[PDB]
Paper text:
Tubulin-binding cofactor A (TBCA) participates in microtubule formation, a key process in eukaryotic biology to create the cytoskeleton. Tubulin-binding cofactor (TBC) proteins, of which there are at least five, are intimately involved in this assembly process, but the details about specific contributions are limited. In order to underpin dissection of TBC function and delineation of structure–activity relationships, we have instigated studies of the trypanosomatid proteins and now report a crystallographic study of one, TBCA, from Leishmania major. This protein is thought to make an early contribution to the assembly process through delivery of β-tubulin onto a second protein, TBCD. In one model for microtubule biogenesis this TBCD–β-tubulin complex then facilitates α/β-tubulin heterodimer formation.
Numbering used by the authors: 19 to 125
The structure:
Amino acid sequence: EAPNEKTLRIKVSALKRTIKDLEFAKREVERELQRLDTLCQSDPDRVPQQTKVVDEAQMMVPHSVNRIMASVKDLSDYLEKEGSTVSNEELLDLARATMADGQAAVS
């Protein structure tokens, strides 16, 4: 209920969501590339539309990466400021674990 604890929790949850976003976005690229091939053979009048969706799917990967990194920096900055005094050891461990998961997810 400490306001710094509450803010830290929100930032950790936000970061976790950006990481899951990238995972689903990467899985979807592979599907869009398949969805292209399917619609290619079944219905090539849809291929132009799906070519454009595939290209956008691929660009959504760096977009998702950029969001993870912006969230990692925000959390990291907070931990140097009002987050620096949080006494909840397990929340601090979780914040550090989640940052490490984000860094792993990019790279």
